[PDB]
Amino acid sequence: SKETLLQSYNKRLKDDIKSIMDNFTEIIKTAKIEDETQVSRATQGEQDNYEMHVRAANIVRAGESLMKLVSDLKQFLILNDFPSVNEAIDQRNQQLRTLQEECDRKLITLRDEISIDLYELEEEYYSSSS
Amino acid sequence: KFQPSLWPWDSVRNNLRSALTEMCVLYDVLSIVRDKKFMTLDPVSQDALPPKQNPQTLQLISKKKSLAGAAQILLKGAERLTKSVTDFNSELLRLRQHWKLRKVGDKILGDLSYRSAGSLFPHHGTFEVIKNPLDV
Amino acid sequence: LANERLRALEDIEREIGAILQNAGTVILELSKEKTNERLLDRQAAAFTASVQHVEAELSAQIRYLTQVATGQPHEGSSYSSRKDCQMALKRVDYARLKLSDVARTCEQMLEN
Structure with a gap:
């Protein structure tokens, strides 16, 4: 339903913000240097490098998901935000009415001028001697 | 030499299966260690002398390199978003x-008919929108 | 119409700014010497302010969308006015063609 879709959007937003914050905080925490005990410097360093790269990838993925959320929200607004549909419909209607009225005024003035010319031509043609 | 039709994503599978081999090596060695037969354990007190101050300098250069790679992937994604x-x-x-x-x-x-405009014509004008x- | 959409565009740009501020902060932390630790604090506050107001804008817009959603397909339209405008324009075109024909017969009469 509409409620269900809006809830789902809320869930996605909360999840994305939470993920960006958590990944950044975890990267900062690993960035701490600590004294080693039973971790074998080389292994500890490679594991830390992998963790940082994976977390950065996760942050980028969360940003892409936030872009997807913004796109979905834009689609919902363009499709069913009733006020803006009403202002678009009304503006379209008023513009088309003004164009119709301009066309009809042009046609009516054309008819009157053509009618006066027709009167002159009728007098000339019917009163021709031949 | 042929594989289940995976001609991209083969080298990732090579690295992952090499990891799978050494992880099966770890499971193997700790399992045969875990039974008393075929492998045994002896507690030995031995000590090592570190020739250089390894945790300070190694943690330093490795963490600066790790933070370098992390900032690289982050800022590359950022400029991808800028151009995107x-x-x-x-x-x-x-x-x-x-x-x-x-x-x-x-x-x-979308509706194409005049049924909003008042026609009772028994035909719906449903047109699809296609990216x-x-x-249409 | 341009208002809420421009808000969505701004939130797009600020998501980019959030990622760039993350990247700039770890850029400054990766430096061998990072003298501008005050600027590190400024970039950190910039990052957190970006994430927070992105959350604020998107939460506000989901709330506003919750207030004006109906689940019904909006039975309004603007078809009849477009139809009448098309008929008016085709009246004008018909009169133009007929005036061309009358002017052509007048040119044939005056031409001799």
């Missing part, structure tokens, strides 16, 4: 500004 934003929903703006639209399921449909920027 610099067109579909603008055409949906224009299309909704002229036409009557709705959404059912994932599909986005291809936009088509």
Whole structure:
């Protein structure tokens, strides 16, 4: 339903913000240097490098998901935000009415001028001697 | 030499299966260690002398390199977003500004008939909207 | 119409700014010497302010969308006015073609 879709959007937003914050905080925490005990410097360093790269990838993925959320929200607004549909419909209607009225005024003035010319031509043609 | 039709993503499978071999080596060695037969354990007190101050300097250079790679992937994604934003929903703006639209399921449909304008014509004008920027 | 959409565009740009501020902060932390630790604090506050107001804008817009959603397909339209405008324009075109024909017969009469 509409409620269900809006809830789902809320869930996605909360999840994305939470993920960006958590990944950044975890990267900062690993960035701490600590004294080693039973971790074998080389292994500890490679594991830390992998963790940082994976977390950065996760942050980028969360940003892409936030872009997807913004796109979905834009689609919902363009499709069913009733006020803006009403202002678009009304503006379209008023513009088309003004164009119709301009066309009809042009046609009516054309008819009157053509009618006066027709009167002159009728007098000339019917009163021709031949 | 042939594999289940995976001609891209083969080298990732090589690295992952090499990891799978050495992880099976770890499971193997700790399992045969875990039984008393075929492998045994002896507690030995032995000590090592570190020739250089290894945790300080090694943790330093490794953490600066790790933070370098992390900032690289982050800022590369950032500039990808910059070039990525610099067109579909603008055409949906224009299309909704002229036409009557709705959404059912994932599909986005539109009405083409004058049934909003008063015709009781037994034919629905449902046209689909298809991203291809936009088509009908 | 341009208002809420421009808000969505701004939130797009600020998501980019959030990622760039993350990247710039770990850029400054990766430096061998990072003298501008005050600027590190400024970039950190910039990052957190970006994430927080992105959350604020998107939460506000989901709330506003919750207030004006109906689940019904909006039975309004603007078809009849477009139809009448098309008929008016085709009246004008018909009169243009007929005036061309009358002017052509007048040119044939005056031409001799």
